[PDB]
Write a protein that binds this DNA or RNA. Structure first.
Ligand code: K
Ligand code: K
Lengths: 109, 109
DNA sequence: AAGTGAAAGGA
DNA sequence: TTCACTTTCACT
């Protein structure tokens, strides 16, 4: 029932997602790990936990019952992020290419 | 105004809606064409006539006056179907994906 | 973009 | 729950 933004803040603040941290907590600028699933070094446990968590949280994935679908978890998460009116991407800082790729977002006050 | 259940029965019986037919008339089980409007092959006259009629019936669309809005017609129809007490969806046969997407419902006795 | 469940929402 | 759907919201 918890909407994406407050849920996301809780995810960042919990430090339980590798790579998910605030770049500037004050201005609410944070970064999300965004490594390509085709790139060597990618691992479901290291790179998709945040996407999986959103899927579990929204009933789209039931651990043990549903077959892991990282591609959909990521696409669903991105689309949901795109639709949020209070969170926008800071593209000049994002680097969604190469190893340890990531995206930077700022939560609108 | 005629309610949705007897209205729907009339539509199915009129044999004027492409694809809208009883799969088992005695048990009141029928199928409604449910092709995704973005899929290639979708045409308003072929895939959205039923949704359009519910829109016209309920004052939500005046041909010639209102600009066609198949997206809303479908959403309105589905939401009205979801609320109906005596009409349930047979999920086990509602092949929603593919070339010929459809939904199966059953009017409860 | 088209689609959806859930739940707030004229006669 | 006035009733029988209808519209808005937040996200395949
Ligand atoms: K956004
Ligand atoms: K129903």
């Amino acid at each position: 029932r918890m909407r994406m933004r407050p849920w996301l803040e809780e995810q960042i603040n919990s430090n339980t997602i590798p790579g998910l941290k605030w770049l500037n907590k004050e201005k609410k600028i944070f970064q999300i790990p965004w490594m390509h699933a085709a790139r060597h070094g990618w691992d479901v446990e290291k790179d998709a936990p945040l996407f999986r968590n959103w899927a579990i949280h929204t009933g789209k994935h039931q651990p043990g019952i549903d077959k892991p679908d990282p591609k959909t978890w990521k696409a669903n998460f991105r689309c949901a992020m795109n639709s949020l009116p209070d969170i926008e991407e800071v593209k000049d800082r994002s680097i969604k290419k190469g190893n340890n790729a990531f995206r930077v977002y700022r939560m609108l006050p």
